Amino acid sequence: RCCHPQCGMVEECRK
């Protein structure tokens, strides 16, 4: 999925 700060990843991605 898009876990990028640009997409709006409210939760810090694992990678």
Q: Which residue has the tokens 């640009």?
A: 6
Q: Are the C-beta atoms of residues 13 and 7 closer than 8 Å to each other?
A: no
Alpha carbons 7 and 13: distance in angstroms, whole number: 12
Amino acid at 6: Q
- Residue type present at position 11: E
First to last CA, the chain: 12
Method: NMR
12, HSE (Cβ side, Cα atoms, 13 Å): 0
Question: Which residues make Cβ contacts (< 8 Å) with residue 5, sequence separation at least 6?
Answer: none
